[PDB]
Amino acid sequence: TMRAVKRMINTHLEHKRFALINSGNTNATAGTVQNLSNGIIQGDDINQRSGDQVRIVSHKLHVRGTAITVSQTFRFIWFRDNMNRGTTPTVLEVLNTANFMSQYNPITLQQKRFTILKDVTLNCSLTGESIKDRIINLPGQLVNYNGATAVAASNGPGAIFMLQIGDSLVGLWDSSYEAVYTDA
Amino acid sequence: TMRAVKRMINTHLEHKRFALINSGNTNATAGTVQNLSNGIIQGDDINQRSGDQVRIVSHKLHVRGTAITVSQTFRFIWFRDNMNRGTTPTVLEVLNTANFMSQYNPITLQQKRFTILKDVTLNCSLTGESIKDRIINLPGQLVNYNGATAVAASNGPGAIFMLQIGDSLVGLWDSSYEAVYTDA
Amino acid sequence: TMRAVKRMINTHLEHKRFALINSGNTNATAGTVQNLSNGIIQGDDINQRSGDQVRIVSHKLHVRGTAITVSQTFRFIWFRDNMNRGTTPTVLEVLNTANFMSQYNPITLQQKRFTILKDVTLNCSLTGESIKDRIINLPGQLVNYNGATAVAASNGPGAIFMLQIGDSLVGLWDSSYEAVYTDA
Amino acid sequence: TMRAVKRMINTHLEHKRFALINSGNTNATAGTVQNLSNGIIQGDDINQRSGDQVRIVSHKLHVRGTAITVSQTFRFIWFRDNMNRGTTPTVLEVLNTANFMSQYNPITLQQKRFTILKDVTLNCSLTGESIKDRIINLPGQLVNYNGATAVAASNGPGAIFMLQIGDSLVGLWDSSYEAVYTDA
Amino acid sequence: TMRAVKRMINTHLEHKRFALINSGNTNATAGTVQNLSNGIIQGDDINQRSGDQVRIVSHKLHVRGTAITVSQTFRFIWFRDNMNRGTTPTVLEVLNTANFMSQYNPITLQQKRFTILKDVTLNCSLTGESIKDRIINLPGQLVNYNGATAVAASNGPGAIFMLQIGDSLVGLWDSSYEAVYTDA
Amino acid sequence: TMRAVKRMINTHLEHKRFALINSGNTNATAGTVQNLSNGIIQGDDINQRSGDQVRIVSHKLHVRGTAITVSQTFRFIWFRDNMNRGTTPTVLEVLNTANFMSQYNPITLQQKRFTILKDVTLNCSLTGESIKDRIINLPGQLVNYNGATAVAASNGPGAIFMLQIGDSLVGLWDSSYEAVYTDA
Amino acid sequence: TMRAVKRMINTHLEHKRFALINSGNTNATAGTVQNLSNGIIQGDDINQRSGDQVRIVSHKLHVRGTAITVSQTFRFIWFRDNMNRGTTPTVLEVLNTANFMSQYNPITLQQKRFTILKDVTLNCSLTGESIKDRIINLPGQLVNYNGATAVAASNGPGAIFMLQIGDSLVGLWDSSYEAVYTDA
Amino acid sequence: TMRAVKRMINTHLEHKRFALINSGNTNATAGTVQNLSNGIIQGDDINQRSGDQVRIVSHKLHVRGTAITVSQTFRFIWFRDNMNRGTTPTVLEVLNTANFMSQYNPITLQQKRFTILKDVTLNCSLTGESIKDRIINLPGQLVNYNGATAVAASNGPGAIFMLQIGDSLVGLWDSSYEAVYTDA
Amino acid sequence: TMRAVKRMINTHLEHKRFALINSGNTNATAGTVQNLSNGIIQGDDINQRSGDQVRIVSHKLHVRGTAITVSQTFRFIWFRDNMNRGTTPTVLEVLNTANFMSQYNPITLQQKRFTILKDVTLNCSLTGESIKDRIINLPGQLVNYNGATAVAASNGPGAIFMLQIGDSLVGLWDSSYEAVYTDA
Amino acid sequence: TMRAVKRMINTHLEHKRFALINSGNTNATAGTVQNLSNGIIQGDDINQRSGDQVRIVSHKLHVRGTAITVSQTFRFIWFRDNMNRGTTPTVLEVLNTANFMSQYNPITLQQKRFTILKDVTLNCSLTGESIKDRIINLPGQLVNYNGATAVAASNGPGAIFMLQIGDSLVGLWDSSYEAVYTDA
RNA sequence: UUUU
RNA sequence: UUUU
RNA sequence: UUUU
RNA sequence: UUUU
RNA sequence: UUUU
RNA sequence: UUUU
RNA sequence: UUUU
RNA sequence: UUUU
RNA sequence: UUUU
RNA sequence: UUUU
């Protein structure tokens, strides 16, 4: 009667929820890495956690880019850091070179330091569609923490991040994120 | 091997417990609505909760009425507000009219805004049995909250209440309540 | 051929018996805890014991309340102290608050320090039935002792008690108890 | 499909962990009792707890003795107090007499007030092996608490302790303990 | 074809009948024991017997209490004396102490000297129900006699009695009894 | 696997033993009744008892008669008093008339007040065999007591006795008795 | 359903317990014999007995030796005297010669007068491990007594003893013993 | 025909081998972490590797401690860093506190940052065995690297290390290590 | 029904027993051979024999060594001489060379002149454990004799011996032996 | 009927035997390699061989170390040279470096030039056990020779050796060896 | 078959 | 069924 | 099914 | 039967 | 089939 | 087999 | 299989 | 059939 | 049936 | 199939 137990088990666990929004950021040619799961801190509220582990049932990422001054490209890489030891990964840890066209870092991907959840490229044209967006929903996994508060040192194995990189410094991008998780 | 899993699952979950007492209240001809599950606030103690959900395994209500000056009637309606959005329901939401003999509000019951758990009427006579009481134990259900503290705004879908209404303002009634719940 | 062995085994064991009576006690608003199984002391008579263990086959409690001066309530809680280390439990160990309407202590009940055998409330009215009584018979369990004589220090795991609490200090209550036990 | 459910259930529960160390204590001829599980207090961190119950999946005790001045014996008794009501057990509750060679208290063991997890005796010789140690790992059980903080009054049914007793007051002993537990 | 024979056998045996009434007796604090089956004496009439044995097919007891001067309690214990040697049992043979709240005599009940058929307690209140009654019908058993006439010396193994005891000497009680028996 | 359990149960129960001797008694024409099981009193020794019940596994009676002055007859009736209420039965309770040739009392035997274990008559001749004896061994049954010491009032249901009666007052008889019993 | 009955039978029997300690004894070249089960005397306490038989469920012996002045050997022979008639066995009854290296007495072992439970030899060196100890736990058997008190004359078939013998008179040895037994 | 393929596959792969020795190190009270697999660098020799991955078939660790000046303890923890990002782990990452008696770091073990292969404690006594050693052989797993040379930055997921910590700074310890691995 | 006959046969045969002790012997660098079974001579006692054959059911050897002046080694070789013709074997018959480190004589072992039962080496250190011992129990075989008395000429096929050899002449060794045999 | 043939075949082949002893050698920090099977030369005696092949059925090695001046370590590596071409292997052929803590030579072990039979390390302490020994017995294999006499040039594929290496030059070690072989 |  |  |  |  |  |  |  |  |  |  397997799989039916999975259903019953989850009906006894509270599905806590955490929402985040990050608007009006500039496109970055050298790229940046944004925290997504870090915001769930130790506490008793619906968007907090008990202990240093949570299990994401599902999470959703919404990304948006707006071209300014020149038509440009925005790339967003949603990823899981399977081996985080209390840091916010650098762009070069994920990409071979710090360029929006770069392929993944051969070494970190070989050893599975990261798992790419979604890699999205939005081309925003000032002579066409200057505003573009994408929403992605995916089932989640375990998230471990190394601390209680919303600081880099608290990120742990399973931490969720988003790398943004593009070919201009003038355009603006927005993002929002939601995680539904159990905390038993 | 179903139903056996239900047993095992619960053996791994702490059955927290919350107790409440509300003594020496006056009988109300227009009625009043008392909070029962609201008292379980966010915290780490045995009678508190993590997050905004708990699952009542069982709960018990004890009601008592004492006639004073004149023989009178005390009515106690134990109910669940399946759709609470952060309030303490009014008497008229539950009863068609604000009278101890009234039937339920046709509209709120049709839409199942409330689920009546037990409706008890105690007739206390100053020429007979002037003191009467009733204890009721029932299995519970999920309780959702809209906030962390013991205020009306924190009541949510599944909140438990008790409406008291009678035909005099002089008699005194007492009540106590216990909820055994899991908080995983 | 199980269950048939249970029958045969008991036919070879003497079913000793102990009787107790406790009349004319005042109702207590703060409550009191009375000893029931403590009276079976080490000795060779029919109502005594060899060693520090006996197995209650069945026991019976008779409680009675009589209103005096004012109509009042008498509550009697028959219980087993599963973890007694040589004491007579306090009222607050059993009840959340020292009030006749109180629910059980959340902590001691969660950990199963006590097992409630029967909780009886008698409302005695001087304008109605001023005298009320209740007799309850139940199968018993193992009783461990921590000493040889009838003192608090001899109570042990499985000791049987009765808590009495009410809303007046003037009424009078009576009780009697019988335990049928094996002592092999 | 039993036993497989046990596996799945635990994969959804955070296995919190608590570590403790107690170094440089003097050997005691009258003995002492040390707290082991008491240190897990109410809170939101990885080594804390929600409510008054936790379930130890596994725990480990490390004991060490060093002879000083004279060759001597160190005894360590790892035990569970199945009936703790908010205390640190005394040596005489566990041992018949307060001597390192004593057998267990007949009464408390008969009634199963305690469950002995491991009884270790280390003989440290100043003409041989003056330093000895032992590490023991065992599966755990439920632990109930009677309070929120790290004080004796918070110990409850299932509390874990270690009794140390020897034949000298001069030697030094060290100990450390780890508990892996679920807190759902 | 068993059980069918039981039916046929009884159709060939006369079911004799004996009726008795005992009205206007005072409540007794020290108690009294009344004869019920003793009245069936040797003779040829419908309510008499041949020899020293009869077999009660069924018998019925009706008890009634009326409070006088003060609200009071009436207790009636219907019992069979399995070992009567020509006497009317004393109150202390049946009850541990001569008090209406007393439990049964441990020794006589252990050895099964008596079999309790019904134990009834009626609380009569001068501020409520001052008159109460109870009728009980039960299948009977063999009754042996030690003599021919209606005197104590004629009671024998199986004799039926009723013990009455209360908390006042002023109230009045009434009783009546009927026995349907075969006399083959 | 029945009957095998009977064997195992008894291997766990101590088979206590009691021995008695009664020598040099005169033959009695009116008869006398001697106590046999009464001598087992409350205590902790091998020939004593805990409580008011024992179960005789087996018992043995040895009787002897010696004619003196004239050839004469000695009768010994070994019996169980199934309904003893604290007495030593009289000769007339057992025998129709107080004569060594008498048949049993019709009334007491009809109601099974007594169970005859063995009825022995020894004719001792001064011109032949002047000395005669008989030893009888039989399985036993439950023995109930009404007190702790070796007095008549302690005899209870199941008590064992021996009636002696003859046709002369001059001859001498001796007897001895042994009871093997469990006392669980 | 055998073996299951053994389990059930024992659940109805009190497992009494007796503890003993014997510290600071000198090593003996001619040997000595110590009593272990003799200390359980007739009485009503948890470490006493009813009658002259008990059944040891399990027993444990703890022996310890400490070299003094010279490195030396301590031998401890735990044994059961299957035929004790009220004595403390002599060393020569157990050993062929009174020497710590001796083999068992050929005659007493051939006839099974004794059953060796454990034979332990501890070599304590003043240039190495000067302190050594051994704890042994074993299931027990029936123990018969010849008297009520703790004197040699009370030892009987099944009595438990410990013989100590070594190669010096200066070293010191300690021992402790526990017996868990039924006494039905 | 599974498992047989595993055999055949390995017969086609060269089992390269790497040996290391680290002698004459001082005991460390704050502890140190030594590299074991780091020494396998990129190259074409038998003890080198192609690429950034190797699969250890088996590896062996030999540890040794020698007491100097004072009797002391040496602890060696052989472990795998499952998430290494180019570092030599610190003592505090593995142990809760920097003490030889400390339990593991609760956080890093919860998230499985490390896998303990073997935890060995050697007590070296200057009055007994001053020199002690232990050799351990275990099957291995995948080893990922982050660089080509023997520097900390080259350690990667699966890197093998050994933590040494003790209670003195004077004693000396030695170690050696061998890894047999495939490099296909 | 084989093997069951072996059991029955032996129950009809007396298991005679012989004990021996040999204390305070000096360690021998050239070695010595001691007689073990030779001591069983023709006679009628429990430790003697009828005829020239006995069958050892079981035998036990206890050896002990004590270092004196210098730390040294004691070797004890328990063996059976399968072909003895009336002698005490020489050391060179058993060992290739007369040295405590020597392997067995190639020729005598090839032809199975001897069967080695146990070869024990005890290293006794004056800076550690200066006293060591070993007890060995083994099933036996047939023993043939060539004479009636305890002299070398009486040893025959199957004779049991013990060779002792060491690296010093100063240490002292002790031994004892027991043989349980049938003599039908 | 396989495996049974192996038994029969060997019963027709002489099991020749060779014994060797090598006493009083100094511990070597650079190590040495000793010959074990080389001593079996061409000839007709029981410890010699016909031709250049023998098959070792079983062989045994006995090693011993004695600390002198300083506590020290002795390592003994019993091995088979599967590819010997007429030499006594060097220490560096077997060990990576000439140190007693060294792991095996990666190259020679990879190619299976040697097969390690047993690797033993003995730590001899002048403050504890200064003398230690180990005896190892193992089944053997084919042994090929390259010559007729006991010189290095005669060693061939399968030759047996023992490498000794330690951390001092002062201690003394002894060894002995036996080989049982067929020579058909 | 089960039950005080 | 097997075992001292 | 068996076990303290 | 399976699924959020 | 069972039951007063 | 099912149940707090 | 049954029995003190 | 399984295993370094 | 298997084993030195 | 079972297991941390």
Verify C-A touch: 3 or more CB pairs within 8 A.
no
The nucleotides of chain O lying under 7 Å from a protein CB are 2-4
The nucleotides of chain P lying under 7 Å from a protein CB are 2-4
Strand S reaches within 7 A of the J141 CB: no
Q: Which residues in chain D have their CB less than 8 angstroms from residue A49's CB?
A: 44
| Å separating the CA of residue D180 from the C1' of nucleotide T4 | 12
The residue type at F124: C
Phi, psi dihedrals of residue I92, rounded to the nearest 5°? -65, -20
Show the tokens assigned to E21: 């009434």
Q: How many CB atoms lie within 10 A of CB D103?
A: 24
Q: Rounded to whole angstroms, how far apart are CA atoms I75 and I28?
A: 10
Cα→Cα distances B18→B40, B47, E175, G124, Å: 7, 5, 52, 61
For the four alpha carbons of A101, A107, A113 and A115, in that order, the dihedral sign comes to: positive
Q: Rounded to whole angstroms, how far apart are CA atoms C145 and C133?
A: 30
Footprint of strand N on the protein (CB under 7 A): A 1-4, 6-7, 57-58, 139
Q: Which helix (H) or strand (E) holds B8?
A: helix B4-11
- Look-up of token digits 């240190």: D39
Residue F74: which CATH number? 2.60.120.20
Show the tokens assigned to D121: 């005796």
Angle D171-D175-D178 (CA atoms, 0-180°, nearest 5)?
175
Q: Rounded to whole angstroms, how far apart are CA atoms J45 and A100?
A: 86
Mention every residue, 6+ apart, whose C-beta is less than 8 A from residue G142: G53, G54, G55, G56, G158
The bridge status of strand F114-124 relative to strand F15-26 is unpaired
Cα→Cα distances G62→F82, F104, G162, G175, I149, Å: 53, 66, 11, 5, 45
| Å separating the CA of residue I4 from the C1' of nucleotide S2 | 23
Show the tokens assigned to I31: 């070695």
- What is the radius of gyration, based on Cα positions, of chain I? 17
Show the tokens assigned to B168: 């005099």
Show the tokens assigned to E131: 């008159």
By what method was this entry solved?
Answer: X-ray
Nucleotide nearest to G180 (CA to C1'): M4
Please measure the distance between the N-terminal and C-terminal CA atoms of chain C and give it in whole angstroms: 23
Question: Residue by residue, what is the 3-state secondary structure of chain G?
Answer: CCCHHHHHHHHCCCEEEEEEEEEEEECCCCCEEEECCCCCCECCCCCCECCCEEEEEEEEEEEEEECECECEEEEEEEEEECCCCCCCCCHHHHECCCCCCCCECHHHHHCCCEEEEEEEEEEECCCCCCEEEEEEEEECCEEEECCCCCCHHHECCCEEEEEEEECCCCCEEEEEEEEEEECC
Nucleotide nearest to J180 (CA to C1'): S4
Q: Which helix (H) or strand (E) holds I6?
A: helix I4-11
Closest-CA residue of I relative to J68 is: I71
Enumerate residues 34 to 93 of chain C having a beta carbon within 8 A of any beta carbon in chain F.
Answer: 44-46, 48, 50
Q: How many CB atoms lie within 10 A of CB H97?
A: 15
Mention every residue, 6+ apart, whose C-beta is less than 8 A from residue H65: H27, H72, H74, H122, H124, H131, H132, H133, H166, H171, H172, H173
Mention every residue, 6+ apart, whose C-beta is less than 8 A from residue B3: none
Do the annotations mark residue E127 as ligand-binding? yes
Q: Which helix (H) or strand (E) holds B91?
A: helix B91-94
Q: Rounded to whole angstroms, how far apart are CA atoms E56 and F6?
A: 36
Mention every residue, 6+ apart, whose C-beta is less than 8 A from residue F95: F31, F102, F103, F104, F105, F163, F165
Q: Rounded to whole angstroms, how far apart are CA atoms G181 and E139?
A: 47
- In the 38-97 stretch of chain B, whose C-beta falls under 7 Å of nucleic acid strand P? 57-58
Do the annotations mark residue H119 as ligand-binding? no
Strand R reaches within 7 A of the H68 CB: no
What residues are paired with G144 via a beta bridge? G53
Q: How many CB atoms lie within 10 A of CB F170?
A: 12
Q: Does A150 touch chain D (CB under 8 A)?
A: no
Quote the minimal CA–CA distance from C33 to chain F in Å: 29
Question: Residue by residue, what is the 3-state secondary structure of chain H?
Answer: CCCHHHHHHHHCCCEEEEEEEEEEEECCCCCEEEECCCCCCECCCCCCECCCEEEEEEEEEEEEEECECECEEEEEEEEEECCCCCCCCCHHHHECCCCCCCCECHHHHHCCCEEEEEEEEEEECCCCCCEEEEEEEEECCEEEECCCCCCHHHECCCEEEEEEEECCCCCEEEEEEEEEEECC
Give yes or no for a contact between I60 and I180, defined as CB atoms under 8 angstroms apart. Answer: no
The bridge status of strand D72-81 relative to strand D114-124 is antiparallel
What residues are paired with J110 via a beta bridge? none
Transcribe D92-129 into DSSP letters.
HHHBSSSSTTPPBPHHHHHTTSEEEEEEEEEEE-TTS-
Q: Which helix (H) or strand (E) holds E56?
A: strand E53-66
Mention every residue, 6+ apart, whose C-beta is less than 8 A from residue B126: B67, B69, B70, B71, C127
The total domain count for chain G is 1
What residues are paired with F15 via a beta bridge? F182
Please measure the distance between the N-terminal and C-terminal CA atoms of chain H and give it in whole angstroms: 23
E4: burial class by Cβ within 10 Å (0-12, 13-18, 19+)? exposed
The nucleotides of chain L lying under 7 Å from a protein CB are 2-4
Residue-level length of chain A: 184
Transcribe C88-144 into DSSP letters.
---HHHHBSSSSTTPPBPHHHHHTTSEEEEEEEEEEE-TTS--EEEEEEEEE--EEE
Do the annotations mark residue A53 as ligand-binding? yes
Phi, psi dihedrals of residue E79, rounded to the nearest 5°? -145, 160
- What is the radius of gyration, based on Cα positions, of chain A? 17
Residue-level length of chain D: 184
Inter-chain contact G128–I128, Cβ cutoff 8 Å? yes
Residue to test with chain F: of E83, E84, E109, E114, most F Cβ within 10 A:
E83
Q: What is the number of alpha carbons within 13 Å of residue F77 lying toward its C-beta? A: 26
**Angstrom resolution of this structure:** 6.0
Segments forming the whole domain that contains residue J143: 1-184
Q: Rounded to whole angstroms, how far apart are CA atoms G80 and G144?
A: 11
Q: Rounded to whole angstroms, how far apart are CA atoms I148 and E124?
A: 105
Helix (H, G, I), strand (E, B) or coil at J41: coil
Q: How many CB atoms lie within 10 A of CB D53?
A: 24
Q: Rounded to whole angstroms, how far apart are CA atoms F21 and F37?
A: 12
Transcribe D7-75 into DSSP letters.
HHHHHTS-EEEEEEEEEEEEP-SS-EEEESSTT--BSSSTT-BSTTEEEEEEEEEEEEEE-BSB-EEEE
Verify C-F touch: 3 or more CB pairs within 8 A.
yes
- Look-up of token digits 């021992």: G175
Q: Rounded to whole angstroms, how far apart are CA atoms D155 and D151?
A: 8
Residue to test with chain G: of C6, C8, C48, C52, most G Cβ within 10 A:
C52
Q: Does I29 touch chain J (CB under 8 A)?
A: no
Helix (H, G, I), strand (E, B) or coil at I86: coil
Enumerate residues 126 to 145 of chain F having a beta carbon within 8 A of any beta carbon in chain E.
Answer: 144
| Å separating the CA of residue E57 from the C1' of nucleotide O4 | 10
Q: Which helix (H) or strand (E) holds I138?
A: strand I131-139
Quote the minimal CA–CA distance from D48 to chain B in Å: 10
Helix (H, G, I), strand (E, B) or coil at I126: coil
* DSSP E strand stretches across F40-113: 53-66, 72-81
Cα→Cα distances E14→E1, E57, E180, Å: 23, 11, 10
Angle I172-I178-I183 (CA atoms, 0-180°, nearest 5)?
150
Helix (H, G, I), strand (E, B) or coil at I76: strand
- Look-up of token digits 């070869």: I119
Phi, psi dihedrals of residue A100, rounded to the nearest 5°? -60, -15
Mention every residue, 6+ apart, whose C-beta is less than 8 A from residue J137: J58, J59, J60
Helix (H, G, I), strand (E, B) or coil at C170: coil
Q: Rounded to whole angstroms, how far apart are CA atoms J99 and J77?
A: 13
Q: Which residues in chain G have their CB less than 8 angstroms from residue C53's CB?
A: 14
Mention every residue, 6+ apart, whose C-beta is less than 8 A from residue J92: J98, J105
Binding residues of G for Ca(2+): 14, 44, 50, 53, 127, 183
Show the tokens assigned to C45: 């008579």
What residues are paired with B81 via a beta bridge? B114, B159
| Å separating the CA of residue F136 from the C1' of nucleotide Q2 | 25
Give yes or no for a contact between H165 and H99, defined as CB atoms under 8 angstroms apart. Answer: yes
Q: How many CB atoms lie within 10 A of CB E26?
A: 15
Nucleotide nearest to F6 (CA to C1'): Q3
User: How far does Cα H68 stand from its chain's mean position?
Assistant: 24
Show the tokens assigned to H156: 């990667």
D99: burial class by Cβ within 10 Å (0-12, 13-18, 19+)? buried
Q: Does H169 touch chain J (CB under 8 A)?
A: no
Inter-chain contact C125–B127, Cβ cutoff 8 Å? no
Closest-CA residue of F relative to G145 is: F46
| Å separating the CA of residue I82 from the C1' of nucleotide S4 | 18
Cα→Cα distances H176→G91, H134, H136, J96, Å: 56, 11, 11, 11
The residue type at E34: Q
Show the tokens assigned to F113: 């007040």
Verify G-A touch: 3 or more CB pairs within 8 A.
no
Q: Does H29 touch chain D (CB under 8 A)?
A: no
